[PDB]
Amino acid sequence: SIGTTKLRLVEFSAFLEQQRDPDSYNKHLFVHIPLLESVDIRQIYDKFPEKKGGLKELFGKGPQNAFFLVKFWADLNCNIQDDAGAFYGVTSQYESSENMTVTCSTKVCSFGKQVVEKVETEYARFENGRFVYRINRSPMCEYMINFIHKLKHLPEKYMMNSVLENFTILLVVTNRDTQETLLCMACVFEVSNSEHGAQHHIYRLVKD
Ligand SMILES: *CCC(=O)Nc1ccc(C)c(Oc2ccc(Cl)cc2)c1
């Protein structure tokens, strides 16, 4: 799932950690993570950067099989109250057969222009016969937290899906030493209506 032979995505969790007292805590998940359906990559070009270093140039440069598309169904049903000890975090994990230095570039884009870019570099750890790259408790950007607050204030869910059409996040995982594309996840977001659930669909990007 969401992976090639050279790199595999194990877990992708974006959460909100809350504590009202040491007696009772709670971590609420916004999004959580063998043949993939095919989606034309040209359909999502406008939503992601088209300039140098954009999704289009990356496709030509990098391997075609490494690119994917994810439709996240985000769970926005959570009580947002006092600041207290609240933490917005993204925990990711990648496991790979080969040893390398991995760079995780998270670009949160609005209206097809990158607003905030988070570049992180992780070193290899040998665990259970493979190399596991774990990015633990990435503190969420102040932009993204204020963004989530902007969503929850919206009265009707149908409105949220409308603004989120312009909200995209392009994960690009790269080998630092070789400058080779290892994995790429174009993510689009929609709200899922449920008492407590999160859904996600994964597609493979192709040019045809
Ligand atoms: C600001 C850094 C960051 O990691 N932002 C980020 C990237 C990806 C994902 C999936 C995040 O989690 C959410 C995105 C969108 C919504 Cl509506 C909810 C959570 C956050």
UniProtKB/Swiss-Prot annotation:
Tissue localization of expression: Preferentially expressed in skeletal muscle. Lower levels in pancreas, placenta, and heart.
Keyword field: Acetylation, Activator, Disease variant, DNA-binding, Nucleus, Phosphoprotein, Transcription, Transcription regulation
Residue ranges of the region described as Transcriptional activation: 1-208
Molecular function terms from GO: DNA binding; DNA-binding transcription activator activity, RNA polymerase II-specific; DNA-binding transcription factor activity; DNA-binding transcription factor activity, RNA polymerase II-specific; RNA polymerase II cis-regulatory region sequence-specific DNA binding; sequence-specific double-stranded DNA binding
Modifications the protein undergoes after translation, according to the UniProt entry: Lactylation by AARS1 promotes nuclear localization and stabilization of YAP1, leading to increased Hippo signaling pathway. Delactylated by SIRT1.
Localization, UniProt: Nucleus
Main location: nucleus
Any one annotated GO CC term: nucleus
Example of a GO biological process term: embryonic organ development
Function: Transcription factor which plays a key role in the Hippo signaling pathway, a pathway involved in organ size control and tumor suppression by restricting proliferation and promoting apoptosis. The core of this pathway is composed of a kinase cascade wherein MST1/MST2, in complex with its regulatory protein SAV1, phosphorylates and activates LATS1/2 in complex with its regulatory protein MOB1, which in turn phosphorylates and inactivates YAP1 oncoprotein and WWTR1/TAZ.
Record: disease: Sveinsson chorioretinal atrophy: Characterized by symmetrical lesions radiating from the optic disk involving the retina and the choroid.
Subunit and partners: Interacts with YAP1 and WWTR1/TAZ.
The protein, known as: Transcriptional enhancer factor TEF-1
Gene it is expressed from: TEAD1
Interval of the full protein contained in this chain: 210 to 426 of 426
